[PDB]
Write an enzyme that holds these catalytic residues in place. Structure first.
Site, PDB file in Angstrom:
ATOM      1  N   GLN A   1       0.897  -1.100   0.053  1.00  0.00           N
ATOM      2  CA  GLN A   1       0.090  -0.010   0.056  1.00  0.00           C
ATOM      3  C   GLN A   1       0.930   1.270  -0.068  1.00  0.00           C
ATOM      4  O   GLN A   1       1.840   1.202   0.830  1.00  0.00           O
ATOM      5  CB  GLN A   1      -1.036  -0.082   1.341  1.00  0.00           C
ATOM      6  CG  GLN A   1      -2.241   0.736   1.007  1.00  0.00           C
ATOM      7  CD  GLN A   1      -2.091   2.003   1.640  1.00  0.00           C
ATOM      8  OE1 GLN A   1      -1.201   2.595   1.689  1.00  0.00           O
ATOM      9  NE2 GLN A   1      -3.530   2.761   1.699  1.00  0.00           N
TER      10      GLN A   1
ATOM     11  N   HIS B   1      -2.409  -3.555   0.035  1.00  0.00           N
ATOM     12  CA  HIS B   1      -3.518  -2.784  -0.483  1.00  0.00           C
ATOM     13  C   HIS B   1      -4.511  -3.810  -1.081  1.00  0.00           C
ATOM     14  O   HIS B   1      -4.093  -4.699  -1.768  1.00  0.00           O
ATOM     15  CB  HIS B   1      -2.869  -1.813  -1.548  1.00  0.00           C
ATOM     16  CG  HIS B   1      -4.110  -0.641  -1.952  1.00  0.00           C
ATOM     17  ND1 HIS B   1      -3.997   0.138  -2.876  1.00  0.00           N
ATOM     18  CD2 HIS B   1      -5.176  -0.514  -1.392  1.00  0.00           C
ATOM     19  CE1 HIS B   1      -4.930   1.026  -2.813  1.00  0.00           C
ATOM     20  NE2 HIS B   1      -5.801   0.722  -2.087  1.00  0.00           N
TER      21      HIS B   1
ATOM     22  N   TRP C   1     -11.312  -1.945   7.969  1.00  0.00           N
ATOM     23  CA  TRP C   1     -10.894  -1.794   6.609  1.00  0.00           C
ATOM     24  C   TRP C   1     -11.584  -2.834   5.712  1.00  0.00           C
ATOM     25  O   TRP C   1     -11.162  -3.255   4.648  1.00  0.00           O
ATOM     26  CB  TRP C   1      -9.432  -1.590   6.221  1.00  0.00           C
ATOM     27  CG  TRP C   1      -9.189  -0.263   6.651  1.00  0.00           C
ATOM     28  CD1 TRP C   1      -8.492   0.128   8.018  1.00  0.00           C
ATOM     29  CD2 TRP C   1      -9.491   1.167   5.991  1.00  0.00           C
ATOM     30  NE1 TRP C   1      -8.480   1.495   8.060  1.00  0.00           N
ATOM     31  CE2 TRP C   1      -9.038   2.118   7.056  1.00  0.00           C
ATOM     32  CE3 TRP C   1     -10.311   1.580   5.110  1.00  0.00           C
ATOM     33  CZ2 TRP C   1      -9.285   3.511   6.821  1.00  0.00           C
ATOM     34  CZ3 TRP C   1     -10.373   2.904   4.747  1.00  0.00           C
ATOM     35  CH2 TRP C   1      -9.695   3.871   5.498  1.00  0.00           C
TER      36      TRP C   1
ATOM     37  N   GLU D   1      -9.930  -5.770   3.274  1.00  0.00           N
ATOM     38  CA  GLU D   1      -8.461  -5.271   3.038  1.00  0.00           C
ATOM     39  C   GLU D   1      -8.028  -5.939   4.616  1.00  0.00           C
ATOM     40  O   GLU D   1      -6.761  -6.188   4.576  1.00  0.00           O
ATOM     41  CB  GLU D   1      -8.332  -3.984   3.083  1.00  0.00           C
ATOM     42  CG  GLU D   1      -6.822  -3.499   2.819  1.00  0.00           C
ATOM     43  CD  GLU D   1      -6.838  -1.992   2.544  1.00  0.00           C
ATOM     44  OE1 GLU D   1      -6.763  -1.123   3.261  1.00  0.00           O
ATOM     45  OE2 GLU D   1      -6.461  -1.718   1.287  1.00  0.00           O
TER      46      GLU D   1
ATOM     47  N   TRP E   1      -4.138   5.714  -8.520  1.00  0.00           N
ATOM     48  CA  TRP E   1      -5.429   5.771  -7.737  1.00  0.00           C
ATOM     49  C   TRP E   1      -6.439   6.644  -8.491  1.00  0.00           C
ATOM     50  O   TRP E   1      -5.921   7.918  -8.780  1.00  0.00           O
ATOM     51  CB  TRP E   1      -5.357   6.224  -6.195  1.00  0.00           C
ATOM     52  CG  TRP E   1      -4.721   5.178  -5.304  1.00  0.00           C
ATOM     53  CD1 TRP E   1      -3.882   4.198  -5.819  1.00  0.00           C
ATOM     54  CD2 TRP E   1      -4.770   5.145  -3.886  1.00  0.00           C
ATOM     55  NE1 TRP E   1      -3.314   3.703  -4.665  1.00  0.00           N
ATOM     56  CE2 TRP E   1      -3.859   4.210  -3.355  1.00  0.00           C
ATOM     57  CE3 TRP E   1      -5.559   6.149  -3.047  1.00  0.00           C
ATOM     58  CZ2 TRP E   1      -3.490   3.929  -2.026  1.00  0.00           C
ATOM     59  CZ3 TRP E   1      -5.184   5.887  -1.777  1.00  0.00           C
ATOM     60  CH2 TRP E   1      -4.298   4.882  -1.152  1.00  0.00           C
TER      61      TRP E   1
ATOM     62  N   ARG F   1     -21.329   6.312  -3.717  1.00  0.00           N
ATOM     63  CA  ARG F   1     -21.690   5.512  -2.373  1.00  0.00           C
ATOM     64  C   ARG F   1     -22.919   6.180  -2.116  1.00  0.00           C
ATOM     65  O   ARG F   1     -23.324   7.179  -2.194  1.00  0.00           O
ATOM     66  CB  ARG F   1     -20.866   5.558  -1.326  1.00  0.00           C
ATOM     67  CG  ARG F   1     -19.258   4.726  -1.791  1.00  0.00           C
ATOM     68  CD  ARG F   1     -18.352   4.577  -0.672  1.00  0.00           C
ATOM     69  NE  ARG F   1     -17.081   4.041  -0.796  1.00  0.00           N
ATOM     70  CZ  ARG F   1     -16.316   3.945  -0.010  1.00  0.00           C
ATOM     71  NH1 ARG F   1     -16.379   4.474   1.168  1.00  0.00           N
ATOM     72  NH2 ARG F   1     -15.153   3.024  -0.470  1.00  0.00           N
TER      73      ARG F   1
END
Ligand SMILES: O=c1ccn([C@@H]2O[C@H](COP(=O)(O)OP(=O)(O)O)[C@@H](O)[C@H]2O)c(=O)[nH]1
Ligand SMILES: [Mn+2]
EC number: 2.4.1.87
Length: 287
Positions: A166, A199, A233, A236, A275, A284
């Site tokens: 990550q 990650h 998380w 993850e 990213w 969301r």
């Protein structure tokens, strides 16, 4: 037949971690000889798979850019199959694919909570590996859709089980890692333990290994549900627990999944994937 030294030279990047205590290579720009690997894998006529989920507005916001970039940069020179999981196939961006690329799309059920949409991927991937992927590819990568390929992401990344370092924590000490720290969770990792913080946006390996990765992670996810707890998380946290117990045979440097919000420090020589800026207010619908 293929030996590490044949394609991996850690001395090319002396300022970063290139080998783990269990002898797994950490692939950094400069340490790999893709030419040697391309020849080796081409002779074996391998096919590489890539799964990606896009549920809800993640489809319109990230799917096309992800697929377009993957077509151009993922395992160029080798047969590739993109496995696309969406909740609404009518919104599927049908882009033109290049030589050695092909795909297929599946309609999946949209979970009500985004947290479950992310975690359910573990269950779904496993089902597909058993149903067809195991018979179609030699290696498989499972990735988040909210990112874009920036340069060649090739055979140098293949292995039995592959993890991604990550971007924020690659130089941090274990006690700073954002592991799930509540012993009530199946994803629990005690302070004083841990190798790296992986990650969940990228992981892979042979279909056999990925099936185990996904199966074990999903068992932990279901276990937590029965204990009325949800990992900090989500998938993850579980993925990190899995890799602590079953160490990856290969790790990819942050160059393979970089967050430009950090900037571009000296260690990141050539970014292969970046990213996408977060847009939770739109993509969301809960918490
Ligand atoms: O509503 C949702 C939530 C998650 N995802 C998928 O699950 C991955 C994990 O989610 P997200 O990228 O939001 O996690 P973050 O990287 O921001 O923690 C996403 O890339 C998508 O592939 C999705 O399609 N729809
Ligand atoms: Mn993501």
């Amino acid at each position: 037949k293929l030996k590490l030294s044949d394609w991996f030279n850690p001395f090319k990047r002396p300022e970063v971690v290139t080998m783990t205590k269990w002898k797994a290579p950490v692939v950094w720009e400069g340490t790999y000889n893709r030419a040697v690997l391309d020849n080796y894998y081409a002779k074996q006529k391998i096919t590489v798979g890539l799964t990606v989920f896009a549920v809800g507005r993640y489809i319109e916001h990230y799917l096309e850019e992800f697929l377009t970039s993957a077509n151009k940069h993922f395992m160029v020179g080798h047969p590739v199959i993109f496995y696309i999981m969406v909740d609404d196939v009518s919104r599927m961006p049908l882009i033109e694919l290049g030589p050695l690329r092909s795909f297929k799309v599946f309609k999946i059920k949209p979970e009500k909570r985004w947290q479950d949409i992310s975690m359910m991927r573990m269950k779904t991937i496993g089902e597909h590996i058993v149903a067809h992927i195991q018979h179609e590819v030699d290696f498989l990568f499972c990735m988040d859709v909210d990112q874009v390929f920036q340069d060649k992401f090739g055979v140098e990344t293949l292995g039995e089980s592959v993890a991604q370092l990550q971007a924020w924590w690659y130089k941090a000490d274990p006690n700073d890692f954002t592991y799930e720290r509540r012993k009530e969770s199946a994803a629990y990792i005690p302070f004083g333990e841990g190798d790296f913080y992986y990650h969940a946006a990228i992981f892979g390996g042979t279909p056999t290994q990925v099936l185990n990765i996904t199966q074990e992670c999903f068992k932990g996810i279901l276990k937590d549900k029965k204990n009325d707890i949800e990992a900090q998380w989500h998938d993850e946290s579980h993925l990190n627990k899995y890799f602590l117990l079953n160490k990856p045979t290969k790790i990819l440097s942050p160059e393979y999944c970089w967050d430009y919000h950090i900037g571009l420090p000296a260690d990141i020589k050539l970014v292969k994937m970046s990213w996408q800026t977060k847009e939770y207010n739109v993509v969301r619908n809960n918490v």
